[model samples]
Target: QSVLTQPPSVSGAPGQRVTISCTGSSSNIGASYDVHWYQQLPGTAPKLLIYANSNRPSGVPDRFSGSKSGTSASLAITGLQAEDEADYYCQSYDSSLSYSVVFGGGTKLTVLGQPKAAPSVTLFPPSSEELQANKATLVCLISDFYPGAVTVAWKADSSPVKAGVETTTPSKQSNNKYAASSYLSLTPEQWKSHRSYSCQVTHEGSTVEKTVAPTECS
Candidate 1:
């Protein structure tokens, strides 16, 4: 797909509603996959806003919303507050690139100073089995970082696995801290047969990265 697409701006007065759309290419955004959302501020990185194109992650405000139609999707905000004025992003999978993740540039919301929480991440795997694709799903949470966008990547040994990646706003797990997650699906062979497939997540202020190798099912 063409990554994802969001408008440059979505505006409204307090209590008003606004919507931002994300359009993908033919390679992704099909009936079989899911779409996720993210939000970002001027000097801060992005956060998770929605999951599965609708489900709200823990600690996310009701103001943010998301939806998908064919190769296109959207994130909507209601009761627009000044704090809601920031950038928003949408994410989803691309099977073409071995399910490599993709994200929209972002939509700038012209309303406020700071948001209730920083942006974060989420996943919408069809079932628990998908969560166990690589024998486990790794959640690398980042907290208190600022003014920069972080990249979350999955690597195999010394190389990167081209898969779909989505970003979202962080939900407050504790004081001034935020959490996020990335998703991937690999066959038993891709895991056990392969030597290493690491989860590499990076931010400007700090880095929280992990390298996980697959183990025999037995």
Candidate 2:
């Protein structure tokens, strides 16, 4: 569900090699548009790694390489090091949609020897059923994650529920880290019968799950 799709994650030990792939369509990379690679960490702007297909910026190291052909582009890191652990994204211009520049979904890189920071979690209870208009909304705040890419899920009666849920993209927040929100809404009649519901947040190396029990409302 991304403009350019990338693998969610990749891991490698120090001194090894790893590649992150980004694939697009005929209107994008296939149109011979330039591809660029970026490295990012939470609370910081992405740093350009490769520009104009395979060219490295002035100070970027040679160990990181990039290339593009057809509908695909890839970034490879050789002799991988611990400090390289972060997120990487690929970008290209698309001819199909308003001739816009689009980016890949992004990939998280984990170096075996490095520590991965997990996100902080908080849940906001829904207002009373009577106060809502046709629905009750529950929010889960996921914050303070480094190199953030988290999995958010909702459950009712401890079983997974997907309808009427919307999750926002992560933004900068507390402790100079990323923050995101998940909203869950249930119909008024549906809300009254729920006794067990949960917000489960999964980030690298950690998970925070919180459950809610709605008090009966006539």
Candidate 3:
């Protein structure tokens, strides 16, 4: 089965729009299959966004939505807000891979400075800029993210991005949270624009979330 492709980071100013991409395949999105989205923060689990392509999961706001056709999928966020800044992820089943599902390497988001408007939620990217193209890189960071069992997704337009995995700490933080990184390669075009991307963290069975859009990309 092919893996999904997503930008490592995205950014946007308050009130601006942004999007994240999830690229998959027939084994996933190409087959009229349902796609799932999740949101995650620096130290939390993933959250469900769109299911079955466009169906928003219960409790998920209407602002969060999924769409897929051919070999890609997407998560869109409108009415941007600062607090909505976080990582986003995409997931889908691949029968060729024995129904094994995969996620993008958490795509980080940035929502700019604090906002004076109501605490509206608008998902942004992990970094202030879109991820660099054709380079393997860190898509998301987790500290104190427990339960061990986890899957990292790297997606673009819901399609899978080829990548490698490493379990080593290049750095540590003041909070004593260990860091892990995932690497993926893509075209410069993939990183441009306000694309929608998600990085989800699933642990112990329950999923928590954070999400970001393209404007969140610097």
Candidate 4:
């Protein structure tokens, strides 16, 4: 058995409740080790929600709860909100595996039945101002996507762009949507050519493409 096991995912609409389970074995929970729970949002480190099996940290809401029964434990969220949609993980100590710490496989909590909005994608090629100084940077902006997970890619003509790329983790917006950006740097000579480049964004079961060709510097 794995040191810890959890469902791959769980889903619920807003104002509902959902529980994520973490199962352990004789080497862990059954061995009387305390289980701790954590909430991990897309772009941030994990925050401890529950500790010592069922205790909440100072700022955790009372609507969040935890419990342990026998060799299994559970984390529960009540009156679920869009912001609650995140990854949940459980941790415990194993007595047989060198008495080490172990974590569950993680459960992705999806908020369902909300307005489905595809990402608004835009491609910003290196600006005329930057190009004048021989600097080139291409950016792809993806915004307002529900469920918060999206993939972004870049292509030059028919070939894949493999290097000089940087992508940011999705950030949750106040509207409960998500946004992210990816950048690709280019050389002045490459920008001067009439070469075609495309920024592809995949979200909400759809792929959106925005293509651009650099303009001459003034």
For lDDT, the strongest prediction is: 4
| Residue lDDT tens for model 4, 1-218 | 45699999999989999999999998899988999999988667999999999999999999899999999999999999988878899999997847598999999888888887899988888887897998899889989997778988889876788687899999877567889999988887876674778888888678999888864232
Assess each prediction's global lDDT (C-alpha) against the native: 0.65, 0.84, 0.59, 0.87
**Which ranges of candidate 1 are over 4 A from the true structure?**
112-218
- Model 1 Cα lDDT, one tens digit per residue, 28-138: 786447888877765577887799989899999987777888888878888887667567888887888585888888877765333343334332222347545545343
TM-score winner among the candidates? 4
Question: Model 4: residues >4 Å from true position, as ranges?
Answer: 128-137, 147-176, 180-218
Ten-residue region with minimum lDDT total, candidate 4: 209-218
The ten-residue window of minimal lDDT in model 2 covers 170-179
| lDDT-sorted candidate list, best first | 4, 2, 1, 3
For each candidate, how many residue pairs have backbone atoms clashing (under 3 Å)?
22, 0, 68, 0
User: What's the CA error at residue 32 for candidate 4, in Å?
Assistant: 2.0
Deviation from truth (RMSD, Å), model 1: 16.3
lDDT per residue as tens, model 3, 1-218? 32888888888777777888888777777876677888875566777767777887788777666678788888888777655667898888778757677776667777665422111112233342444333323355544542234455555546544444333343322222233444433334444542654444444465434444545434
Clash total of candidate 4? 0
Cα RMSD to the true fold for all candidates: 16.3, 8.6, 21.0, 4.6
Better candidate number, 3 or 4, judged by TM-score? 4
lDDT of model number 3: 0.59
- 1 versus 3: better lDDT goes to: 1
TM-score of 3: 0.50
